[PDB]
Ligand binder design. Structure first.
Ligand SMILES: [Mg+2]
Ligand code: NA
Length: 354
């Protein structure tokens, strides 16, 4: 029987000279159970869902601050830093953004002058969204995921940009405008990030690299890269992770690990064990070795890495379960964190606290 998360040394304290230790949270978890873990181990939080575009402005001019406000009040009360996720994304984003003045989707407009008008309108809606959100949470947010996942996993164009509605309408102008607007209202010391998954993987890594390089050359204020780090036990390699972070540091950018989880499975995540109890200890041990190697790298690169956030707290709640179930006919349990479903420590915790 492993000790509870509150009965062991703090992760935040352990890595105090190196980087923040973070967790993704929902409002329902800011009660005692998961609150005891959070206060003990973490000095930074992020909203798992409550600060995404549709979570804040579901309809034009109607704002839903309550979930986000609760998360911010917890950050304040418990003296935690706060990453904002996220100002721009092609998912969890409300439809009204992309409808023209006549209520029709902007993508199905052909007259080029009207497209130009719709592009301007879309950029102005974006700007007002960012303006409003930033003016509210300016003095609480310590890092901004300004745009999320704007680089494609393949190569549908030579710049490797994701061809979402944002891109279909504006090209890369939404990225520029997102950053420009956030700098403008958040201030000069606000740390503005571009966040993505598979930042360690070529060709995507090089497309991301080239993108931030082009925008920096045009004076677009990007202070850092967010590495989501939705990784596996043996993928990506430690050297691929290292190489990516070194590359972005060499552009004078900061690195942050933003959504870390160490899945027990490959991609796609099958076969998955049906339940937590059915997962063999063997697999938790392979996970612990991986974590040890991960955090030695992170600590080695602490000059260039300011924050390491896990995308959840304990193994009872993780979006990786959705993915497991998806690929195993509705049955699947992953276990990506250093704390188990009853908030007891796992082998992985011991390998990163030492
Ligand atoms: Mg270790
Ligand atoms: Na650091």
């Amino acid at each position: 029987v492993q000790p509870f998360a509150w009965q062991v040394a703090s992760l935040a304290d352990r890595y105090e000279e190196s980087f923040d230790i973070g967790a993704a949270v929902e409002p329902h978890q800011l009660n005692g159970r998961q609150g005891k873990v959070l206060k003990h181990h973490y000095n930074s939080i992020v909203a798992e869902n409550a600060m995404k575009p549709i979570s804040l402005q579901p309809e034009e001019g109607v704002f839903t601050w309550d979930g986000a406000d609760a998360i911010v009040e917890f950050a304040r009360k418990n003296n935690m830093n706060l990453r904002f996720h996220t100002l721009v994304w092609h998912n969890q984003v409300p439809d009204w953004f992309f409808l023209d003045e006549e209520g029709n989707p902007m993508v199905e407009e052909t007259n080029e002058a009207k497209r130009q008008a719709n592009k301007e309108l879309l950029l102005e809606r974006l700007e007002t969204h960012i303006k409003t959100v930033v003016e509210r949470y300016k003095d609480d947010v310590t890092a901004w995921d300004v745009v999320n996942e704007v680089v494609d996993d393949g190569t549908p164009n030579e710049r490797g940009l994701r061809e979402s509605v944002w891109y279909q309408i504006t090209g890369d102008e939404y990225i520029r405008v997102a950053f420009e607007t956030a700098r403008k209202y958040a201030g000069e010391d606000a740390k503005l990030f571009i966040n993505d998954y598979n930042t360690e993987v070529t060709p995507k890594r090089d497309h991301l690299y080239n993108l931030v390089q082009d925008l920096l050359a045009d004076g677009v204020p990007i202070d850092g890269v967010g590495h989501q780090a939705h990784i596996q036990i043996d993928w990506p390699t430690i050297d691929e992770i290292r190489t990516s972070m070194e590359m972005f540091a060499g552009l004078g950018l900061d690195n942050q690990v933003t959504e870390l989880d160490v899945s027990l499975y490959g991609w796609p995540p099958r076969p998955a064990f049906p339940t937590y109890d059915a997962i063999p200890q063997e697999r938790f041990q392979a996970q612990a070795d991986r974590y040890n190697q991960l955090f030695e790298l992170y600590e080695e690169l602490d000059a260039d890495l300011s924050s390491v956030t896990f995308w959840g707290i304990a193994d009872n709640h993780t979006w990786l379960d959705d993915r497991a179930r998806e690929y195993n006919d509705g049955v699947g349990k992953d276990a990506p964190f250093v704390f188990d479903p009853n908030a007891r420590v796992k082998p992985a915790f011991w390998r990163i606290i030492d």
